[PDB]
Amino acid sequence: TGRPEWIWLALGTALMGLGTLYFLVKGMGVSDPDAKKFYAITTLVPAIAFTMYLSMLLGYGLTMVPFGGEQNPIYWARYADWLFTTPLLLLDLALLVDADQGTILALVGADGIMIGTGLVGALTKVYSYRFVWWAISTAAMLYILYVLFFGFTSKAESMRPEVASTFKVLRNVTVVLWSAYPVVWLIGSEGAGIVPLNIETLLFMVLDVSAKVGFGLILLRSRAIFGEAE
Amino acid sequence: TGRPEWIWLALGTALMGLGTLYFLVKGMGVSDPDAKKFYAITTLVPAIAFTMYLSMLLGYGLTMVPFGGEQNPIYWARYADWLFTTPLLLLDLALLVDADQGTILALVGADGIMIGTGLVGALTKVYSYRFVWWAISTAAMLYILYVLFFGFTSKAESMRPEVASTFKVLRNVTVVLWSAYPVVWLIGSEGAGIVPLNIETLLFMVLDVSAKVGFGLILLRSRAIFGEAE
Amino acid sequence: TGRPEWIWLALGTALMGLGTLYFLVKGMGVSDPDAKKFYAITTLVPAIAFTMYLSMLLGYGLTMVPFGGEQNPIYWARYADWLFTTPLLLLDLALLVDADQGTILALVGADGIMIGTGLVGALTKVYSYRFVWWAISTAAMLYILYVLFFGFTSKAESMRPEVASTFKVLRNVTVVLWSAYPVVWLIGSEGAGIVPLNIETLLFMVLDVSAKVGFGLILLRSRAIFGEAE
Numbered sequence: 001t002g003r004p005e006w007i008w009l010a011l012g013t014a015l016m017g018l019g020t021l022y023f024l025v026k027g028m029g030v031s032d033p034d035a036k037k038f039y040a041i042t043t044l045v046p047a048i049a050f051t052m053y054l055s056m057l058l059g060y061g062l063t064m065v066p067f068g069g070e071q072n073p074i075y076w077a078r079y080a081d082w083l084f085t086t087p088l089l090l091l092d093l094a095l096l097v098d099a100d101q102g103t104i105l106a107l108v109g110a111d112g113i114m115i116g117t118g119l120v121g122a123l124t125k126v127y128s129y130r131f132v133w134w135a136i137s138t139a140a141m142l143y144i145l146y147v148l149f150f151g152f153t154s155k156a157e158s159m160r161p162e163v164a165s166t167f168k169v170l171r172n173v174t175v176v177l178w179s180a181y182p183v184v185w186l187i188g189s190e191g192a193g194i195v196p197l198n199i200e201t202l203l204f205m206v207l208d209v210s211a212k213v214g215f216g217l218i219l220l221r222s223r224a225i226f227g228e229a230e
Numbered sequence: 231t232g233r234p235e236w237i238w239l240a241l242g243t244a245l246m247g248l249g250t251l252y253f254l255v256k257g258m259g260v261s262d263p264d265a266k267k268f269y270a271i272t273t274l275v276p277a278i279a280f281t282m283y284l285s286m287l288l289g290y291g292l293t294m295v296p297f298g299g300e301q302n303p304i305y306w307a308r309y310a311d312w313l314f315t316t317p318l319l320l321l322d323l324a325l326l327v328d329a330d331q332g333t334i335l336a337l338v339g340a341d342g343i344m345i346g347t348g349l350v351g352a353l354t355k356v357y358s359y360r361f362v363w364w365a366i367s368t369a370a371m372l373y374i375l376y377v378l379f380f381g382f383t384s385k386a387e388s389m390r391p392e393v394a395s396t397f398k399v400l401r402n403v404t405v406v407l408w409s410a411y412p413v414v415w416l417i418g419s420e421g422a423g424i425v426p427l428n429i430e431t432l433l434f435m436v437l438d439v440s441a442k443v444g445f446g447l448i449l450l451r452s453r454a455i456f457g458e459a460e
Numbered sequence: 461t462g463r464p465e466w467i468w469l470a471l472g473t474a475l476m477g478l479g480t481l482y483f484l485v486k487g488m489g490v491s492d493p494d495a496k497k498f499y500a501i502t503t504l505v506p507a508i509a510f511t512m513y514l515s516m517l518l519g520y521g522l523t524m525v526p527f528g529g530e531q532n533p534i535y536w537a538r539y540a541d542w543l544f545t546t547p548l549l550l551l552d553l554a555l556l557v558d559a560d561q562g563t564i565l566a567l568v569g570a571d572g573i574m575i576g577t578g579l580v581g582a583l584t585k586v587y588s589y590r591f592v593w594w595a596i597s598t599a600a601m602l603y604i605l606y607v608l609f610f611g612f613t614s615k616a617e618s619m620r621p622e623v624a625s626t627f628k629v630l631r632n633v634t635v636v637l638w639s640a641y642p643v644v645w646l647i648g649s650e651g652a653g654i655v656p657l658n659i660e661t662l663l664f665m666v667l668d669v670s671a672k673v674g675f676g677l678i679l680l681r682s683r684a685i686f687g688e689a690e
């Protein structure tokens with residue numbers, strides 16, 4: 001098609017589709033009520049992403065935003081996907097370590113503020129204000145990262161060894177890949193505009209696939225997702 | 231008013247209003263914590279629908295969408311109602327059979343994908359793509375229907391006989407009436423345009439009232455909604 | 461800036477920010493799983509409000525709506541904030557008295573109808589219809605107020621005395637301050653237009669800060685938020 005980033009949108013669509021199908025077939029027959037929750041959560045994540053990658057591929061998920069005296073292409077469908085997928089991914093982690101309800105609310109609520117302030121920043125027509133929104137969004141993210149190291153890492157250790165080991169890996173995956181998101185937004189098409197749109201779209205595609213399908217491959221092969229049973 | 235479908239919107243509004251009022255008066259005094267949940271869920275459903283039928287009657291819930299080189303009337307308020315009412319109706323069924331949490335998440339999440347992809351298809355400006363969205367939405371629906379027969383029908387039987395009998399009736403009601411929705415959309419104003427808007431609006435009105443107020447009349451007269459008590 | 465109401469938006473922003481920071485520092489170290497829920501809920505409330513007051517300050521949260529043959533400034537960001545903060549505030553109360561699930565659903569669902577019909581009324585382009593939406597919204601509110609006196613006040617009394625006393629105060633705070641909202645909307649810029657926008661913005665600022673940060677100061681100093689323990 002006529003937008004150079006199309007190839008990375010097509011490839012993202014295909015990878016999320018294949019991931020959904022694999023997790024769906026792999027979850028068939030699972031009867032353990034605990035693993036059923038982890039399959040439910042983890043298969044819904046790439047199914048949502050599939051539909052929203054497709055909407056960007058087909059042009060629905062794209063709008064033009066005037067700032068810096070120019071009509072800027074903004075993919076708003078990213079924030080519609082992230083709004084529902086990112087709390088499910090934190091739910092996978094919190095259920096692993098059997099977090100208490102107060103802590104789950106805090107994580108999901110902070111996650112909503114991070115995504116919502118990011119959408120306002122993406123659509124903001126006053127250039128300098130877009131970075132104010134980027135700052136508030138990044139602060140909400142640092143709160144989440146703090147919780148994952150100084151609330152969760154200290155209960156998982158008092159848990160089943162298989163739980164503690166699977167959580168450590170997935171926590172480390174989460175902190176590394178989530179930290180790259182604020183930087184790519186800042187230097188790409190929504191921010192300073194140093195990196196062009198087609199390269200920004202490739203970077204996000206590599207990040208989006210790793211943090212959902214990669215994460216899922218690690219979790220759903222683990223023994224931690226089953227109750228202990230004879 | 232000046233749109234021929236107004237009479238079916240007015241009648242839908244009145245029927246949802248009367249239904250809400252009846253379920254509200256009937257639920258007064260109920261103290262059983264179990265029946266309270268079924269009344270809560272089941273009365274919220276026609277109250278939401280009342281407000282959204284009214285917005286279509288008054289013109290707020292209507293927009294024009296250009297496709298096939300024509301300005302097409304699209305009632306978007308349908309998807310704002312269905313987004314909150316359809317998961318409540320599946321919650322009535324899952325609580326009946328005491329479904330496990332993993333299965334409820336799967337049903338509600340699949341329901342969200344079905345409604346969300348339906349809204350994208352309703353607003354899509356490229357004619358042939360509207361049917362791609364219709365196909366993904368229908369696939370999410372088939373997943374839901376499968377769950378209701380090959381996950382739920384097999385636990386309800388291991389339950390109280392009054393539960394098993396009320397669920398069978400409501401499951402059958404659900405599968406028959408929900409299957410008509412994809413067909414009416416395809417042949418009506420959002421799709422191929424064979425059936426005109428005023429007749430499509432009548433068909434949906436008959437389907438919307440039956441699946442909410444009819445469903446509710448069956449459930450709230452049943453003994454299944456109470457715990458077993460002496 | 462060039463809108464006279466800016467000073468009340470700036471002051472609201474600052475007060476919600478300071479409130480968030482105070483509740484955040486005060487909740488540090490709390491380990492009781494019960495108080496953790498009350499801190500989680502109660503700190504998220506002024507953090508959401510901070511971001512949405514800021515969006516009104518910076519102009520993002522403002523739109524123009526044509527009615528009465530005039531282009532009317534409508535702050536739509538109010539309803540985006542109230543949509544997520546008002547159910548959390550009712551969750552604080554229901555958890556205090558350990559409400560049953562059916563009753564919480566009813567309150568949160570009625571709250572959604574009240575806010576949603578209020579947004580439709582704020583954006584409605586036919587003047588006389590805006591008050592129809594105001595009436596349906598006010599009816600949903602009266603339902604909520606009824607529940608708080610003739611469902612909750614009668615279980616809190618059968619509870620811990622510290623719970624019963626803290627709930628009475630917060631219930632009374634809630635009923636008084638929430639009842640002022642329908643009146644200010646009716647006589648201000650969204651309704652009859654008797655009170656001008658800058659004064660309406662001051663009134664709401666005083667109401668918004670009292671009902672969130674004031675409410676929170678009362679609740680989080682109470683002993684009711686902790687389980688009974690030795």
Ligand SMILES: CCCCCCCC/C=C/CCCCCCCC(=O)OC[C@H](O)CO
Pocket residue numbers: 199202203206
């Ligand atoms: C898992 C196994 C596979 C791992 C794969 C990891 C890929 C992730 C990173 C890709 C960045 C590639 C960036 C390519 C940028 C080219 C930019 C370019 O053309 O620069 C010239 C410019 O136009 C004028 O100076």
Ligand SMILES: CCCCCCCC/C=C/CCCCCCCC(=O)OC[C@H](O)CO
Pocket residue numbers: 429432433436
């Ligand atoms: C529960 C007791 C009551 C049950 C009630 C069930 C009604 C449901 C179906 C109605 C379809 C009616 C369709 C009417 C279509 C008329 C179309 C027409 O006028 O066709 C001519 C056309 O304009 C040029 O060929």
Ligand SMILES: CCCCCCCC/C=C/CCCCCCCC(=O)OC[C@H](O)CO
Pocket residue numbers: 659662663666
């Ligand atoms: C907690 C301690 C502090 C308590 C503080 C409570 C304040 C709340 C109410 C304020 C209303 C003030 C209204 C000011 C209205 C002025 C209107 C005006 O100028 O009227 C003239 C008009 O322009 C032509 O007739």
Ligand SMILES: CCCCCCCC/C=C\CCCCCCCC(=O)OC[C@H](O)CO
Pocket residue numbers: 105108109112113116117119120123508511523540544
């Ligand atoms: C436990 C539940 C916790 C839930 C916590 C949720 C946190 C979200 C808070 C604020 C972001 C609000 C974002 C609103 C963005 C609307 C932007 C929009 O729709 O813009 C339309 C148009 O382009 C412009 O007028």
Ligand SMILES: CCCCCCCC/C=C\CCCCCCCC(=O)OC[C@H](O)CO
Pocket residue numbers: 102103106109110113136139140141143476477478480481483484487490495496497499500503504507510
């Ligand atoms: C002037 C400062 C600006 C205003 C402040 C920034 C607001 C938006 C940013 C981040 C949200 C941070 C997280 C909000 C949620 C906190 C939840 C909480 O306190 O949870 C405690 C509970 O004990 C858990 O275990």
Ligand SMILES: CCCCCCCC/C=C\CCCCCCCC(=O)OC[C@H](O)CO
Pocket residue numbers: 138179182183192194
């Ligand atoms: C722990 C995770 C935290 C994640 C958040 C980290 C944020 C700060 C990082 C980098 C900013 C680097 C400065 C970028 C600003 C460049 C300004 C500019 O105009 O640069 C000119 C350009 O390089 C040529 O034209």
Ligand SMILES: CCCCCCCC/C=C\CCCCCCCC(=O)OC[C@H](O)CO
Pocket residue numbers: 048051063080084335338339342343346347349350353
């Ligand atoms: C457990 C919780 C599970 C929740 C699962 C949720 C599933 C929804 C997923 C994707 C649909 C997203 C739909 C987004 C549609 C937005 C369309 C819109 O607003 O269009 C505005 C404008 O007309 C055009 O720019």
Ligand SMILES: CCCCCCCC/C=C\CCCCCCCC(=O)OC[C@H](O)CO
Pocket residue numbers: 016017018020021023024027030035036037039040043044047050332333336339340343366369370371373
């Ligand atoms: C190439 C194929 C296209 C991509 C695929 C279509 C995606 C969208 C369609 C349907 C969603 C189907 C349901 C998604 C939710 C599945 C939940 C699940 O797996 O739940 C298992 C759990 O054990 C429960 O008891």
Ligand SMILES: CCCCCCCC/C=C\CCCCCCCC(=O)OC[C@H](O)CO
Pocket residue numbers: 368409412413422424
């Ligand atoms: C189990 C529930 C499944 C529900 C989903 C079932 C979907 C397929 C059904 C019918 C499609 C029939 C074909 C419709 C296409 C008509 C094409 C056309 O242009 O027809 C010309 C017209 O008839 C004169 O002008």
Ligand SMILES: CCCCCCCC/C=C\CCCCCCCC(=O)OC[C@H](O)CO
Pocket residue numbers: 278281293310314565568569572573576577579580583
């Ligand atoms: C347990 C969960 C219970 C949840 C209960 C939820 C109750 C909400 C119901 C109806 C309000 C719907 C409001 C929809 C308003 C949309 C307005 C809008 O977006 O307008 C865009 C544009 O300006 C115009 O086309």
Ligand SMILES: CCCCCCCC/C=C\CCCCCCCC(=O)OC[C@H](O)CO
Pocket residue numbers: 246247248250251253254257260265266267269270273274277280562563566569570573596599600601603
């Ligand atoms: C013709 C009349 C117009 C139509 C009617 C107005 C609809 C919208 C207004 C108010 C919603 C009222 C509250 C709706 C929720 C009721 C929940 C319920 O019944 O809960 C019972 C349960 O036992 C709890 O403990």
Ligand SMILES: CCCCCCCC/C=C\CCCCCCCC(=O)OC[C@H](O)CO
Pocket residue numbers: 598639642643652654
């Ligand atoms: C329990 C909580 C309930 C809260 C809900 C209470 C609603 C009714 C209250 C007041 C309406 C007063 C009438 C306002 C209408 C004024 C009409 C008008 O045009 O007035 C002319 C103006 O005063 C000069 O030009």
Ligand SMILES: *C\C=C(C)/C=C/C=C(C)/C=C/C1=C(C)CCCC1(C)C
Pocket residue numbers: 082085086114115118119133134137138141177178179181182185207208211212
């Ligand atoms: C599905 C893929 C994932 C892991 C999405 C994560 C998204 C973020 C961590 C977003 C954070 C942002 C910040 C912190 C600042 C503004 C821009 C973002 C919304 C991308």
Ligand SMILES: *C\C=C(C)/C=C/C=C(C)/C=C/C1=C(C)CCCC1(C)C
Pocket residue numbers: 312315316344345348349363364367368371407408409411412415437438441442
């Ligand atoms: C409140 C009434 C009910 C039962 C609503 C049900 C709606 C559906 C089953 C919608 C399904 C659709 C599909 C499967 C395909 C695109 C069009 C729809 C969104 C109507």
Ligand SMILES: *C\C=C(C)/C=C/C=C(C)/C=C/C1=C(C)CCCC1(C)C
Pocket residue numbers: 542545546574575578579593594597598601637638639641642645667668671672
């Ligand atoms: C965060 C502050 C609070 C307490 C917000 C409460 C908002 C209401 C009680 C809103 C009610 C409305 C009604 C009943 C009628 C239309 C206008 C409103 C949406 C403001």
